[PDB]
Amino acid sequence: IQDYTDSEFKHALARNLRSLTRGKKSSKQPIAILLGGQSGAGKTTIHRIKQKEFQGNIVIIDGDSFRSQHPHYLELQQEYGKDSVEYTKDFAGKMVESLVTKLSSLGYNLLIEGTLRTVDVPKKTAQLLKNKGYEVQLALIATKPELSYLSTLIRYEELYIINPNQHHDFIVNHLVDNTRKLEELAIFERIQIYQRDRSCVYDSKENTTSAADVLQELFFGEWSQVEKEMLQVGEKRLNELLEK
């Protein structure tokens, strides 16, 4: 079926702790950063900023990558063509649980891909992170919802090139709402919003205006010179993938 024995979790978990610890050093002053934002906005940008910003010394935990590590992935792919996800996130999530727990005890710097479409998951996470003595921050990525929906389609036309046998975008309203509430409930020491060109457009340390409001003008504002440019590039590259 899709079961996993307990020695298999400890196996892949022990491996992952060896994996992620590599070349990283602990901190008496550790930092945890949660990631929000539409799926195809390019959160991979924030990775670049915060990896360089911590000069290699931050552990990134991306729940999604841990899917293939299900002891019977091959079997579940050789049936559920794409609907293998709900049989894998049972495993993947607890993998994140154990990783955040252990590494937060050992005081590493952590960057966590967050389910910001829901209010609770992150809240309950940063709470258990601050107890351990973590400066816990929020790092949001924002572009025009369209370009976001676009990159997800670009991605899906490249996810079909690899193996024919292999989203979280429509969230703009949940995303803004959950930001204001996490701001008011004062869960994060620092809140930051980033744009595709790695620019920091909002920093709660410097700025005083609401993080949620800055988001709305970023989503529902008029298109920037560069944004319209990105829109054509997508129409370009999708068409090639329309016949590649």
């Binding site: 491996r15 060896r18 390019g42 991979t44 990896q51 990134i60 560069v226």
Partner: protein, 92 residues
Amino acid sequence: LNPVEDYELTLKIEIVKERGANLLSRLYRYQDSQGISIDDESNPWILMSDDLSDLIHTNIYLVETFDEIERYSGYLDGIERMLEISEKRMVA
């Protein structure tokens, strides 16, 4: 580098990360099916998983040029070629 170049890089970084993670999971698949202990650093398969792991988890994000990407890509290419030959001797 300008905003579009810079993002197109971020996209290549992404493509590579995914592609790498795919291979690492396959490496782990192969390593278990051989009984190779995880920290058996003497084993060439452990070295590959370890190197690649260090890149996906850190180094790709630190890449600043499209050339570095092509290098990492042909490196993955190298891995895959060796990994494919080992699974076909296996289900032989």
